[PDB]
Design a protein around this nucleic acid. Structure first.
Ligand SMILES: CC[C@@]1(O)C(=O)OCc2c1cc1n(c2=O)Cc2cc3ccccc3nc2-1
Length: 565
DNA sequence: AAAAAGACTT
DNA sequence: GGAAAAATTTTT
DNA sequence: AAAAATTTTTCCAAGTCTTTTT
């Protein structure tokens, strides 16, 4: 069937749904304590760990293999959070983490993973079926006249916080989410889901100005987690489509804004000059609008509006470049951003002004935050904020590079390479880095030995063709010529294969320290891709896989070859 | 405001 | 998501 | 048959910006 929601009339502003029914959240599987033969030791002598404490102790044991279990903060926060979940006949004995021996616990769990990957196609087939009966009853909710998929219906198990970067809270206990934390949400006329026996959910909500099915407040940050619908849904995809159409609207008056923020660098007020320089950073330098965040509750990271002075060092000349601003900081997810950038005359001079009589630990743009900057953007264009730039600059770069890369001649596998090269450019601009695949970049030697082997399979068809001509000369007939054809069409089938292997080795080695994912899904207007595919006859499945085709179902169907962002 | 929350987005 | 599992599928 | 190199899931947060509260 497949419901073409994009053909429907836009859902009237404010209300998200008229009717919402769902089976609720699936809870994390109960804890199975340790057997008799898996003993825990403290101060060398055996210790009986109560169910509560035993669990918190496993979470650490299973991580013993990682290098972070040796960091101060990790161990400090851990031990503190373990103390709470301990009995007094245990809070009296265990004074420190350092005297606790998890070695045996840690060993059993590495054995479980082994004994698991050695199962029978009877057990493995049963689990893979019991896992399918859960996805049917719990993974589909009903939102207005339709059956749509839920994204992550399984509530996350309790464990230990790690987070990304050097985070202050690493090692803390993530408590087990009970029904009494869950806030259900659904329509008044919908069958309310039944809670686990002998429990009550925190609240049965009916707020129809939201898209969520369930919410709870996790304890590490005190942030609210949600169980929202699958990206393939209407509610998620109309939002997605809107986000693109909003960045597409930015396109028709982008140069207008670029005229203004240019001369704004020459205004009376520092506040307007700051706002404009920051806007330059977000525009031409694809920075995020860096909100302020609670220090000692998150990893010290930034974005443009939050950039401290210590994140830049002013250089007049370097490598033959004029007015270079050296960026050096940890962006989102503690991912470094280093950029030597030649800026215009006023901008370099404006930055010196913004850094005068200031200490390294102070802001660059004081008198600025995301709030001021975004209030301006709104006035500049109906519905514009500072993230829309990243959507424009990323999307439009794909469209441009696909134009400047794709040649009509190329066979399908080299066009895929051209597309990926386009994607790659966006990725480097949006700084979606990657740590090289776990020493496995010797898979290149194991791909080169396959290419060098094909150079033989072809080299032999070349010397086969050279001898076919040496027989076609002496005694020329329609039996020798039609063989010099079968040896020519043979050089070709191998030539097209070598291309397919070499082009695929380039694609792989260029995308070594880059990440296309976050842009593939989150930043590029899927229609830009779809058009490119319809044009050169590249079957979509070569670019977007099934969950992607499904998420992007709206683009595929509602976009021709002629489409232009 | 403008902090502190909430709901989306990356 | 992006690296790690885990389930595959390719190589040897 | 079994090492090996792949494809695909599973594990687990950190931003942006709107709406409340204070
Ligand atoms: C590296 C890619 C990226 O950081 C990002 O910048 O954009 C996409 C993305 C990320 C992370 C994430 N998600 C994402 O959609 C969804 C999601 C769910 C999670 C659920 C639990 C823990 C971490 C989680 N991280 C992401």
């Amino acid at each position: 069937q497949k419901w073409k929601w994009w053909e429907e009339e836009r859902y009237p502003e404010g209300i998200k749904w008229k009717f919402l029914e769902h089976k609720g959240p699936v809870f994390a599987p109960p804890y199975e304590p340790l057997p008799e033969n898996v003993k825990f030791y403290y101060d060398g002598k055996v210790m009986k760990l109560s169910p509560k404490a035993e669990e918190v102790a496993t979470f650490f044991a299973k991580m013993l293999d990682h290098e972070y279990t040796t960091k101060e903060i990790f161990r400090k926060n851990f031990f503190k959070d373990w103390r709470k979940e301990m009995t007094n006949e245990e809070k009296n004995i265990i004074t420190n983490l350092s005297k606790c021996d998890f070695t045996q616990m840690s060993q059993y769990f590495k054995a479980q993973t082994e004994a698991r990957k050695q199962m029978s196609k009877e057990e493995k087939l049963k689990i893979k079926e019991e896992n399918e009966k859960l996805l049917k009853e719990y993974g589909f909710c009903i939102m207005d006249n339709h059956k749509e998929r839920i994204a992550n219906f399984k509530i996350e198990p309790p464990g230990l916080f790690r987070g990304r970067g050097n985070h202050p809270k690493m090692g803390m206990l993530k408590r087990r989410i009970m029904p009494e934390d869950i806030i259900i949400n659904c329509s008044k006329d919908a069958k309310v889901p039944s809670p686990p026996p002998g429990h009550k959910w925190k609240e049965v909500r009916h707020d129809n100005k939201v898209t969520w099915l369930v919410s709870w407040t996790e304890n590490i940050q005190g942030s609210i987690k949600y169980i929202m619908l699958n990206p393939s849904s209407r509610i998620k995809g109309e939002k997605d489509w809107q986000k693109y159409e909003t960045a597409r609207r930015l396109k028709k008056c982008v140069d207008k804004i670029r005229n203004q923020y240019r001369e704004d660098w020459k205004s009376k007020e520092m506040k307007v000059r700051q706002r404009a320089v920051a806007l330059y950073f977000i525009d031409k330098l694809a920075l995020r609008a860096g909100n302020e965040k609670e220090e000692g509750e998150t990893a010290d990271t930034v974005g443009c509006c939050s950039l401290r002075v210590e994140h830049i060092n002013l250089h007049p000349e370097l490598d033959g470049q004029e007015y270079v601003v050296e960026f050096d900081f940890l962006g989102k997810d503690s991912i470094r951003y280093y950029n030597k950038v030649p800026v215009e005359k006023r901008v370099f001079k404006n930055l010196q002004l913004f850094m005068e009589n200031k200490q390294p630990e102070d802001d660059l743009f004081d008198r600025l935050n995301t709030g001021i900057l975004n209030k301006h953007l709104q006035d500049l264009m109906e519905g514009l904020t500072a993230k829309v730039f990243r959507t424009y600059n990323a999307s439009i770069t794909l469209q441009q590079q696909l134009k400047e890369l794709t040649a009509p001649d190329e066979n399908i596998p080299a066009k895929i390479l051209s597309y990926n090269r386009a994607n790659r450019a966006v990725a480097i601009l949006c700084n979606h880095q990657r740590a090289p695949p776990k020493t496995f970049e010797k898979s290149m030697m194991n791909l080169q030995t396959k290419i060098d082997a094909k150079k033989e399979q072809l080299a032999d068809a070349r010397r086969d063709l050279k001898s076919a001509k040496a027989d076609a000369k002496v005694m020329k007939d329609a039996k020798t010529k039609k063989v010099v054809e079968s040896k020519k069409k043979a050089v070709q089938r191998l030539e097209e294969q070598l291309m397919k292997l070499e082009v695929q080795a380039t694609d792989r080695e260029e995308n070594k320290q880059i990440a296309l994912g976050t842009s593939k899904l989150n930043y590029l207007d899927p229609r830009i891709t779809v058009a490119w595919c319809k044009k050169w006859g590249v079957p979509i499945e070569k670019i977007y896989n099934k969950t992607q085709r499904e998420k992007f179902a709206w683009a595929i169907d509602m976009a021709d070859e002629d489409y232009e962002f």
